[PDB]
Design an enzyme around this catalytic site. Structure first.
Site, mmCIF file in Angstrom:
data_model
loop_
_atom_site.group_PDB
_atom_site.id
_atom_site.type_symbol
_atom_site.label_atom_id
_atom_site.label_comp_id
_atom_site.label_asym_id
_atom_site.label_seq_id
_atom_site.Cartn_x
_atom_site.Cartn_y
_atom_site.Cartn_z
ATOM 1 N N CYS A 108 43.099 40.351 39.716
ATOM 2 C CA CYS A 108 43.414 41.618 40.385
ATOM 3 C C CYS A 108 42.215 42.552 40.541
ATOM 4 C CB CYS A 108 44.535 42.358 39.644
ATOM 5 S SG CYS A 108 45.059 43.918 40.434
ATOM 6 N N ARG A 111 42.501 46.839 39.541
ATOM 7 C CA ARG A 111 42.695 47.260 38.161
ATOM 8 C C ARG A 111 42.151 48.626 37.736
ATOM 9 N NH1 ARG A 111 40.838 42.223 34.829
ATOM 10 N NH2 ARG A 111 39.686 41.772 36.767
ATOM 11 N N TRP A 280 49.900 48.819 46.004
ATOM 12 C CA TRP A 280 49.751 49.050 47.438
ATOM 13 C C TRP A 280 48.775 47.996 47.962
ATOM 14 C CZ3 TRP A 280 48.576 53.243 44.050
ATOM 15 C CH2 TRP A 280 47.212 53.403 43.744
ATOM 16 N N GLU A 285 44.859 41.477 52.849
ATOM 17 C CA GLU A 285 45.982 40.651 52.425
ATOM 18 C C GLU A 285 46.866 40.350 53.645
ATOM 19 O OE1 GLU A 285 47.944 41.612 48.554
ATOM 20 O OE2 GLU A 285 46.799 43.490 48.677
HETATM 21 C C1 HEM Z 1 47.393 49.678 42.940
HETATM 22 C C2 HEM Z 1 47.064 48.748 43.884
HETATM 23 C C3 HEM Z 1 46.748 47.398 43.694
HETATM 24 C C4 HEM Z 1 45.780 46.761 44.427
HETATM 25 C C5 HEM Z 1 44.917 47.380 45.532
HETATM 26 C C6 HEM Z 1 45.722 45.399 43.948
HETATM 27 C C7 HEM Z 1 45.154 44.390 44.717
HETATM 28 C C8 HEM Z 1 45.373 43.035 44.474
HETATM 29 C C9 HEM Z 1 44.981 41.999 45.392
HETATM 30 C C10 HEM Z 1 44.187 42.166 46.685
HETATM 31 C C11 HEM Z 1 45.384 40.847 44.824
HETATM 32 C C12 HEM Z 1 45.345 39.450 45.467
HETATM 33 C C13 HEM Z 1 46.674 39.107 46.139
HETATM 34 C C14 HEM Z 1 46.709 37.682 46.673
HETATM 35 O O1 HEM Z 1 45.688 37.214 47.212
HETATM 36 O O2 HEM Z 1 47.764 37.032 46.559
HETATM 37 C C15 HEM Z 1 45.971 41.153 43.535
HETATM 38 C C16 HEM Z 1 46.391 40.196 42.615
HETATM 39 C C17 HEM Z 1 47.006 40.496 41.390
HETATM 40 N N1 HEM Z 1 47.315 41.774 40.965
HETATM 41 FE FE1 HEM Z 1 46.791 43.524 41.781
HETATM 42 N N2 HEM Z 1 46.612 45.174 42.885
HETATM 43 C C18 HEM Z 1 47.292 46.380 42.760
HETATM 44 C C19 HEM Z 1 48.328 46.570 41.849
HETATM 45 C C20 HEM Z 1 48.774 45.633 40.911
HETATM 46 C C21 HEM Z 1 49.733 45.934 39.876
HETATM 47 C C22 HEM Z 1 50.503 47.248 39.715
HETATM 48 C C23 HEM Z 1 49.750 44.863 39.041
HETATM 49 C C24 HEM Z 1 50.472 44.681 37.845
HETATM 50 C C25 HEM Z 1 51.210 45.612 37.181
HETATM 51 C C26 HEM Z 1 48.837 43.894 39.591
HETATM 52 C C27 HEM Z 1 48.702 42.583 39.113
HETATM 53 C C28 HEM Z 1 48.048 41.567 39.815
HETATM 54 C C29 HEM Z 1 48.168 40.164 39.505
HETATM 55 C C30 HEM Z 1 48.835 39.617 38.232
HETATM 56 C C31 HEM Z 1 47.534 39.504 40.502
HETATM 57 C C32 HEM Z 1 47.499 37.986 40.796
HETATM 58 C C33 HEM Z 1 48.792 37.574 41.494
HETATM 59 C C34 HEM Z 1 48.862 36.080 41.755
HETATM 60 O O3 HEM Z 1 48.302 35.319 40.933
HETATM 61 O O4 HEM Z 1 49.490 35.673 42.766
HETATM 62 N N3 HEM Z 1 48.223 44.364 40.741
HETATM 63 N N4 HEM Z 1 46.001 42.515 43.319
HETATM 64 C C1 LIG Z 2 50.029 41.966 43.160
HETATM 65 C C2 LIG Z 2 50.830 42.819 44.166
HETATM 66 C C3 LIG Z 2 51.977 43.582 43.479
HETATM 67 N N1 LIG Z 2 49.913 43.812 44.824
HETATM 68 C C4 LIG Z 2 49.375 43.326 45.977
HETATM 69 N N2 LIG Z 2 49.654 42.076 46.410
HETATM 70 N N3 LIG Z 2 48.556 44.085 46.701
HETATM 71 O O1 LIG Z 2 47.967 45.173 46.261
#
Ligand code: HEM
Ligand SMILES: CC(C)NC(=N)NO
Ligand code: HEM
Ligand SMILES: C[C@H](O)[C@H](O)[C@H]1CNc2nc(N)[nH]c(=O)c2N1
Ligand SMILES: C[C@H](O)[C@H](O)[C@H]1CNc2nc(N)[nH]c(=O)c2N1
Ligand SMILES: CC(C)NC(=N)NO
Ligand SMILES: [Zn+2]
Lengths: 410, 407
Positions: A108, A111, A280, A285
């Site tokens: 992620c 973070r 968000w 994406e």
């Molecule tokens: C606040 C805005 C957030 C942004 C901009 C962000 C952005 C991203 C992006 C770009 C990815 C890749 C998605 C993909 O390619 O499938 C990702 C993956 C991930 N994010 Fe974040 N994230 C956010 C919030 C969160 C939240 C709130 C959580 C957990 C509470 C989180 C947990 C994760 C996890 C566990 C992954 C990997 C998911 C997977 O393995 O398919 N993210 N995030």
């Molecule tokens: C991991 C998911 C809840 N967030 C996104 N796919 N984009 O920020």
């Protein structure tokens, strides 16, 4: 042992000690690296040690390590485990746990926001209808009329593995996909199998290009049940281009709330199989993956045509050109409708700052480069030039097998 | 033990067994992955020599033959007596071709078996090296119709008689630290550029000055040599629509030739083994031109395109990036100089991977390096899982000579 990480663009070198507290495996060995591989009932015995490690980290985080409160809690949990084979987390521990699983998610890039997470405790939930209500509340709260707020809803933990709570949907909101008899696909190709399951379960599919799928919720190990998310609760954005007036005619739109709902949240050894979470979107994406992946909406050609690009030879980079415009449109549409979104330059710049902050205050930041670097314009974003170390820390979010492959139908 | 690799775009799954013959370490462990880190005795020699010869004779369908056994013992005796050995020309060629074949960070390995090898083991001086190199450059360039080649100088002996090409690439532009505090030319070569001056070179203090070769032979101190300008093929960069582009005054050389790596064959170490192929557009247009620490020209190109550089979300950098890369490919293709775009190159690598899996049992590949610096997910390799591991013969990194040379 200390590990050095260098940014080949700024020469900044960081030292990682955090990895020393890594326990789980990575899939890699000293003879092979599986860094690009997508995915490479406990007993009382292995449970308390896991609970203790967690509780020690928790009490240490609040500066109460060794306190009587800390010691009592450990004895309380120990007794509970021996007495029931499991144990319940205090609300404070749940919040701390959820935030840290996010903080530890190496894949992620968003973070920097980890400490700002609204945690909805749905551990008192017992039925699919209950799950539905909780989820609708999560969606409305998180959407917040376009001004998105990060959130997570945590349902009852796994007990004997036969009473699991699960959200069969991979994301709370996604568009249906339909395989036509001529071999073509209507809608999102990625959701064809799930869509079929929903139809088989009784869903009346409108069979369009952007049909919001129904929720398929499983409570206490029972057969899943269908529910339609109130349309008024599903915020969407029609996609149009700031200069290309024909873009809007492509008939494209996308939902504003990305909410992963198929992962497993592990805290102190406890397993939360239903823990939908959302934040968000980062523009790429949608614009890069959802729209341009050959196995997704695959709109590159059409957009390429309308732009009248030279599609005879790849060396014209027509795909690259159409890609940028599509992503420009996604960002533009969202900002115009005032729906939270972040571009890959901003998100990556922030991640770098977050990362450095984490090395200083925490001794490290596990990160998966393969997933962190954006799917377009890789090297013009700071993360491309950033060496990263990937390791697993708990609490954490883990993958789990799709429910339709393991569920025993009643 | 039999690992599987899946392509998430085509669902195709391949099984990898080749990795089971890996011998060198990857830098990673079960507890940590360093996949994104840029740089993670007679008794030692024979086993290495043996491993190589076994695979060589196996490749020629003479495994466990008298010729195989004979050679094995001859080398064996030679090592015991000379503390080293010499490769037969056939082994040398086989080894070089396979080092390329095993380079996990190279996307253009489908071309691996078509490598011209220049045996420069009889070389003895810096002038001899200059001559061998000019010949390599001329052969490889071939008037724009590039041909892959490698020139192999004398193997290592006692470490105190190593041959080395101090340059990182045979052909690169110099970089100088100006009073402004800014940098003139290629920032990446500032240090090397100075060691040339510090050694005698008369820098024209330009933006694109082809650097001089600093050749080191038999361990002696390195010497300078100017590559015949007529041998250094360059390409002026112009856009096929933005007539103003030329005014940027941008140009790039047509022959990419890595010269600071170490070739390892059957335990033997060739510290000076410059090799070359042909560019993939992105290398120049994305990295050399747009890397902030390189010619960092994004802003300039953005301004001349009149793009709103106020907000990052307008994606001006992305738009400009694409044009800059469309120009590079355009110019090279106009001047009839070999060049391949990331789309074609990546499609080729996928084909190559499939060939390697069905004909060799696998293909070591470093996803981090294979995926192009731009438009990542629209190229097939993005969706292709890859297993990275080290096989010999191979190309290894080695310490910059100026940090090990005892003048
Ligand atoms: C606040 C805005 C957030 C942004 C901009 C962000 C952005 C991203 C992006 C770009 C990815 C890749 C998605 C993909 O390619 O499938 C990702 C993956 C991930 N994010 Fe974040 N994230 C956010 C919030 C969160 C939240 C709130 C959580 C957990 C509470 C989180 C947990 C994760 C996890 C566990 C992954 C990997 C998911 C997977 O393995 O398919 N993210 N995030
Ligand atoms: C991991 C998911 C809840 N967030 C996104 N796919 N984009 O920020
Ligand atoms: C024929 C055209 C060729 C193409 C299209 C190709 C393309 C590439 C590219 C894009 C890179 C990455 C360069 C970088 O980012 O620094 C690379 C790396 C590499 N290639 Fe190839 N290559 C070709 C020929 C060769 C040849 C002839 C050899 C070997 C004799 C070779 C050996 C390697 C090695 C070892 C690396 C990594 C070097 C490093 O770590 O800096 N390549 N190649
Ligand atoms: C095979 C390879 O691991 C796969 O295509 C990965 C690469 N990087 C990714 N990065 C993100 N953010 N999301 C993905 O789905 C992927 N897919
Ligand atoms: C830190 C990270 O390893 C580094 O920026 C890598 C990423 N991928 C790369 N890929 C190629 N082809 N060339 C490079 O120089 C790099 N640099
Ligand atoms: C590794 C080098 C000789 N080749 C290139 N950089 N491009 O093909
Ligand atoms: Zn690894």
């Amino acid at each position: 042992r200390f590990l050095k990480v260098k940014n080949w663009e700024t020469d900044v070198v960081l030292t990682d000690t955090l990895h020393l507290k890594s326990t789980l495996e990575t899939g890699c060995t000293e003879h092979i690296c599986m860094g690009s591989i997508m995915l490479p009932v406990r007993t009382k015995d292995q449970l308390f040690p896991l609970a203790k490690e967690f509780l020690d980290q928790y009490y240490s985080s609040i500066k109460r390590f060794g306190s009587k409160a800390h010691m009592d809690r450990l004895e309380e949990v120990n007794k509970e485990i021996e007495s029931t084979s499991t144990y319940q987390l205090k609300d404070t521990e749940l919040i701390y746990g959820a935030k840290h699983a996010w903080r530890n998610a190496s894949r992620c890039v968003g973070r920097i926001q980890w400490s700002k997470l609204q945690v909805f405790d749905a551990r008192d939930c017992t039925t699919a209808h209950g799950m539905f209500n909780y989820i609708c509340n999560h969606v409305k709260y998180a959407t917040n009329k376009g001004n998105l707020r990060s959130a997570i809803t945590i349902f009852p933990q796994r007990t004997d593995g036969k009473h699991d709570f699960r959200v069969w949907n991979s994301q709370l909101i996604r568009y249906a996909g339909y395989k036509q008899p001529d071999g073509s696909t209507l809608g999102d190709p990625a959701n064809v199998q799930f869509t079929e399951i929903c139809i088989q379960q009784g869903w009346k599919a409108p069979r369009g290009r952007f049909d919001v799928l129904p929720l398929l919720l499983q409570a206490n190990g029972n057969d899943p049940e269908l529910f339609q998310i109130p349309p008024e609760l599903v915020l969407e954005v029609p996609i149009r281009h700031p200069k290309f007036d024909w873009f809007k005619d492509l008939g494209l739109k996308w939902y504003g709330l990305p909410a992963v709902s198929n992962m497993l949240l592990e805290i102190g050894g406890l397993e939360f199989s239903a823990c939908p979470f959302s934040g968000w979107y980062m523009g790429t994406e949608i614009g890069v993956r959802d729209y341009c992946d050959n196995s997704r909406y695959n709109i590159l050609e059409e957009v390429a045509k309308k732009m009248d690009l030279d599609m005879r030879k790849t060396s014209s980079l027509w795909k690259d050109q159409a890609l940028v415009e599509i992503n420009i449109a996604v960002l533009y549409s969202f900002q115009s409708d005032k729906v939270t979104i972040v571009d890959h330059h901003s998100a990556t710049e922030s991640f770098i700052k977050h990362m450095e902050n984490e090395y200083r205050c925490r001794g490290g930041c596990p990160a998966d480069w393969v997933w962190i670097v954006p799917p377009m314009s890789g090297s013009i974003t700071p993360v491309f030039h950033q060496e990263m170390l990937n390791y697993r820390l708990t609490p954490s979010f883990e993958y789990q097998p799709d429910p339709w492959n393991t569920h025993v139908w009643k």
